[PDB]
Amino acid sequence: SMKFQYKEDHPFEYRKKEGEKIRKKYPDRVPVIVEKAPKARVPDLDKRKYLVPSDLTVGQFYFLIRKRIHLRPEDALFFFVNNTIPPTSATMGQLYEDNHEEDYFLYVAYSDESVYGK
Amino acid sequence: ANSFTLIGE
C-alpha cells in the first residue's frame, strides 16, 4: 500500500521509457525515486529522482540521503521499499532488481517513523 | 541523465 506521488506527475509510458533508457545508457547505475512517506514529519529532499551506483549498499545510500536532508543530528530517519525497511548490507542493484516497478524505477520512501505511513 | 541527480559515486 505504498503511495508514491511521482507516479501521478508522469504517465506510466513516459516513466517506463525513461527507466529503460537510463538503464541501457548507464548499466552500472539504477534509477531511484526517493519520496517522503505520507505523514512523515521530515522535510522533503531537494531532489527526488536519483541515479545510484549498483554496488552501493543501502547503508551507504542511507548515509548520503541522511546527510542531504534538512534534519538535526538527533532526528530519526527510516527507509521503506514495499512497506519494509531494506537491509543495510543489500546492494542498491539487488534492491532495484528485487523491487523495481514495471516502469523500471525503484521507489524508496522515508519517514521519521519506523512503520511506513505512521 | 540531465534530470537525474547522481548520488553515491
Numbering used by the authors:
A (entry chain A): 0 to 117
B (entry chain G): 94 to 102
Copy text verbatim from the article accompanying this structure deposition.
Initiation of macroautophagy/autophagy is mediated by the ULK1 (unc-51 like autophagy activating kinase 1) protein kinase complex and the autophagy-specific class III phosphatidylinositol 3-kinase complex I (PtdIns3K-C1). The latter contains PIK3C3/VPS34, PIK3R4/VPS15, BECN1/Beclin 1 and ATG14 and phosphorylates phosphatidylinositol to generate phosphatidylinositol 3-phosphate (PtdIns3P). Two hydrophobic pockets, HP1 and HP2, in the Ubl domain of Atg8 ensure binding of the side chains of the φ and η residues of the core LIR.
Co-crystals of GABARAPL1 with WT LIR peptides diffracted to 1.14 Å for BECN1, and 1.4 Å for ATG14. PIK3C3, BECN1 and ATG14 WT LIR motifs bound to GABARAPL1 in and extended conformation with the two core hydrophobic residues in position 0 and +3 deeply bound to the hydrophobic pockets HP1 and HP2. They all display 3 conserved hydrogen bonds in-between the main chain of the residues in position +1 and +3 of the LIR motif and GABARAPL1 residues K48 and L50. The F at HP1 could be effectively substituted by W, but not by Y. At the hydrophobic +3 position only a change to L is allowed. The Kd measurements for the LIR peptides were completely consistent with the GST-affinity-isolation data with GABARAP and GABARAPL1 as the strongest interactors with the LIRs of ATG14, BECN1 and PIK3C3.
